[PDB]
């Protein structure tokens, strides 16, 4: 009767509170999705316990084993009742789980160290002085893999034979590599994260150009779950009341340092 | 076995072809949603006939009669099998029909005649020299009605006792009233339409400020329809292939006159 809510450690969605080591249960965490879970759980009238995904992944299906991993895997095999996180809505996933209507809108984008002579994906693909990559094992990576557009077809061929490995294990690791590499590495990541990093000290990065595509994040439940319909209406309710906007302001911009 | 596809006359989604009066069936029309219907019908493998909604409305429920009107009404009473149009995803509607994941992202916005001293909704609400309104009987109107935010709570109180009537019967009628009124009338409309009008002669209007909210358009089917799942996957497929973006470019910007 207590719902398991799977999520992922990723600022500023879910983070350890300043004195987390001295608390317990849901009180250890704070962030955008901690609040969202609270508001949803309040319209749907349920008790819940937040739970961090063991492998830290979003959700992909192994081509040989055909097992699903990450948060998606937790719903498919029945270990979690709902996922509340920055999980992208895609065709492959929608075949195996359900999504609510988007609670956030976004697209792929470019992050550079201030001063780098880059304005577009066309600028990146036509040179090799500057190396670039993506988070691993996510929808961003997958996007370049499956592209039939010329410029992106060019970029993925570079990233393919990149030495050393151009991908990263974490968003944090990417940003760090941008900050350390003195403008010789650029990072391709979702614009929600790009926009957040930009308002954080040391204030040395920035988003350049427009977005590569359009998409959204959804709250997910296993196929045929009874919580699916109540969760969708709840999301639409919060959007219509200005709660969603109020929450982005709180965690992105009301605490901006630059 | 031939699917009825309800839609609405609204540029540049659906329009009469240059010589429509000399054609028949689906050949009379052209636009963004005519193409979209074609691509969806091709992945879902069906034959279809486009049909223009009799009353020209989007979809609202009469508070005394409790009958639903517009395109929404056509699905609820079973006269159409699917709707393909700029129909906004809302909580009230989602209770009575189904929506696919959004094929377009947008929000409420401000249209002015070039030269008008307005930059924001805050600028509008704090004065009466300049009159303003919205399309009637749609989600935009409804948004100001239900708002509990101070500035919008102020704006809807004006529009309420406006003399003469500040609302309009058509998008076209609003734009026209902006162009004719020498900067004494401003129009609040969805930004998709604002952006399109801006790239049309006489090139005398423009979008000012940021969007009031975030939302999307969806393709709709009656509750429990068997076409619901195939239509959703088809939309996600077209989005992932760059078809959606390709189509917005075609009807908005590849033919821009300004
Ligand atoms: N949202 C993604 C994960 N994800 C996240 C970031 Cl910040 C990114 O740059 N790329 C991603 O794939 C998904 O659901 O796989
Ligand atoms: N999308 C709306 C209709 N609609 C359209 C325009 Cl262009 C507008 O400015 N306001 C609206 O309500 C709905 O579905 O009711
Ligand atoms: Zn710690
Ligand atoms: Zn004619």
A93 & A54 share domain: yes
In this structure, which ligand is nearest to the CA of A104? 1
Nearest CA, atom 7, ligand 1 = A190
Q: Does A63 touch chain B (CB under 8 A)?
A: no
Comparing CA positions, the residue from A37, A100, A244, A240 lying closest to residue B92 is: A240
B102 & B220 share domain: yes
Q: Is B161 annotated as a binding residue?
A: no
Nearest CA, atom 6, ligand 1 = A190
B157 & B236 share domain: no
**Residue B85 DSSP code:** S
> Are β-strands B185-190 and B131-134 bridged in parallel, bridged antiparallel, or unpaired?
parallel
Q: Could you tell me the two tokens for A87?
A: 């999980």
Q: Could you tell me the two tokens for A162?
A: 């990149």
Comparing CA positions, the residue from B136, B232, B251 lying closest to residue B188 is: B136
Beta-carbon count within 10 A of B70 CB: 24
Q: Does A99 touch chain B (CB under 8 A)?
A: yes
**Which domain does B249 fall in, by range?**
1-106+216-255
Comparing CA positions, the residue from A196, A184, A169 lying closest to residue A112 is: A184
Q: How far apart are the first and last CA of chain B?
A: 45
Show Cβ contacts of residue A209 under 8 Å, excluding neighbours closer than 6 positions. Answer: A109, A110, A119, A120, A121
Q: Which atom of ligand 1 is nearest to the CA of A141?
A: 12
Residues with CB under 6 A from ligand 2: B 58, 86-88, 135, 138-140, 171, 189-190, 193
Q: Where are the alpha helices (DSSP H) in chain B?
A: 32-43, 70-76, 91-94, 121-125, 139-145, 150-160, 171-180, 191-197, 228-240, 243-248
A125 & A170 share domain: yes
Give B175 Cα–ligand 4 centroid separation in angstroms.
Answer: 21
Comparing CA positions, the residue from A88, A92, A101, A55 lying closest to residue A74 is: A55
A132 & A55 share domain: no
Residue B39 has φ and ψ, to the nearest 5°, of -70, -45
A69 & A101 share domain: yes
Q: Which residues share a beta bridge with B188? A: B110, B134
Give how many domains chain A has, as a whole number: 2
**Residue B162 DSSP code:** -
Show Cβ contacts of residue A174 under 8 Å, excluding neighbours closer than 6 positions. Answer: A111, A133, A134, A135, A168, A187, A189
Q: Classify B183 in phi/psi space as left (phi over 0), alpha (psi -120 to 50) or beta.
A: left
Comparing CA positions, the residue from B66, B104, B65 lying closest to residue B85 is: B104
A70 lines ligand 1 (CB under 6 A): no
Q: How far apart are CA A228 and CA A99, in angstroms?
A: 8
List the single residue in A94, A102, A240 with the smallest CB-CB distance to B91.
A240
B98 & B128 share domain: no
B3 & B98 share domain: yes
A123 & A72 share domain: no
Q: How far apart are CA A17 and CA A28, in angstroms?
A: 6
- DSSP collapsed to 3 states, chain A: CEEEEEECCECCCEEECCCHHHCCHHHHEECHHHHHHHHHHHHCCCEEEEEECCCCCCCCECCCCCCECHHHHHHHCCCCCEECCCCECCHHHHCCEEECCCCEEECEEEEEECCCCCCCHHHHHCCCCCEEEEECCCHHHHHHHCCCCHHHHHHHHHHHCCCCCCCECCHHHHHHHHHHCCCCEEEEEEHHHHHHHCCCCCCCEEEECCCCCCEEECCEEECCCCCHHHHHHHHHHHHHCCHHHHHHHHHHHCCCCC
Question: Side-chain half-sphere of B60: how many Cα atoms within 13 Å?
Answer: 13
Give B206 Cα–ligand 4 centroid separation in angstroms.
Answer: 28
A171 lines ligand 1 (CB under 6 A): yes
Q: CA–CA distance from B145 to each of B46, B112, B140, B158 (Å)?
A: 41, 22, 9, 11
A62 & A152 share domain: no
A81 & A178 share domain: no
Cβ contact B149–A242 (<8 Å): yes
Q: How far apart are CA B165 and CA B199, in angstroms?
A: 28
Residue carrying structure tokens 């309420």: B160
B227 & B206 share domain: no
Comparing CA positions, the residue from B142, B100, B245 lying closest to residue A102 is: B100
Q: Does B243 touch chain A (CB under 8 A)?
A: no
Domain CATH number, residue A45 = 3.40.190.10
Q: How far apart are CA A136 and CA A84, in angstroms?
A: 21
Angle between helices A32-43 and A228-240 (to 10 degrees): 110
Q: Which strands form A205-208's sheet, in the order they lie side by side?
A: A131-134, A185-190, A108-113, A205-208
Cβ contact A214–B99 (<8 Å): no
């Amino acid at each position: 009767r207590t719902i398991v809510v799977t999520t992922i450690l990723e600022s500023p969605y879910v983070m350890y509170k300043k004195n987390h080591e001295q608390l317990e249960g849901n009180e250890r965490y704070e962030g955008y999705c901690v609040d969202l879970a609270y508001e949803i759980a309040k319209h749907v009238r349920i008790k819940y316990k937040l739970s961090i995904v063991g492998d830290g992944k979003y959700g992909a299906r192994d081509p040989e084993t055909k097992i699903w991993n990450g948060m998606v895997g937790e719903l498919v095999y029945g270990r979690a009742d709902i996922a509340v996180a920055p999980l992208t809505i895609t065709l492959v996933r929608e075949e195996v789980i359900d999504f609510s209507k988007p609670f956030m809108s976004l697209g792929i984008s470019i992050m550079i160290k201030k001063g780098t002579p880059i304005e577009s994906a066309e600028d990146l693909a036509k040179q090799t002085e500057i190396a670039y990559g993506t988070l691993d094992s996510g929808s961003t990576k997958e996007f370049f893999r499956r592209s039939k557009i010329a410029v992106y077809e060019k970029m993925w061929s570079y990233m393919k034979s990149a030495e050393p490995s151009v991908f990263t294990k974490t968003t944090a690791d990417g940003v760090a590599r941008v900050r350390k590499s003195k403008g010789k590495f650029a990072f391709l990541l979702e614009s929600t994260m790009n926009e957040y990093i930009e308002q954080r000290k040391p204030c040395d990065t920035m988003k350049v150009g427009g977005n590569l595509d359009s998409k959204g994040y959804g709250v997910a439940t296993p196929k045929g779950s009874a919580l699916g319909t109540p969760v969708n209406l709840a999301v639409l309710k919060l959007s219509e009341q200005g709660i969603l906007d109020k929450l982005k302001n709180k965690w992105w911009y009301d605490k901006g340092e630059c």
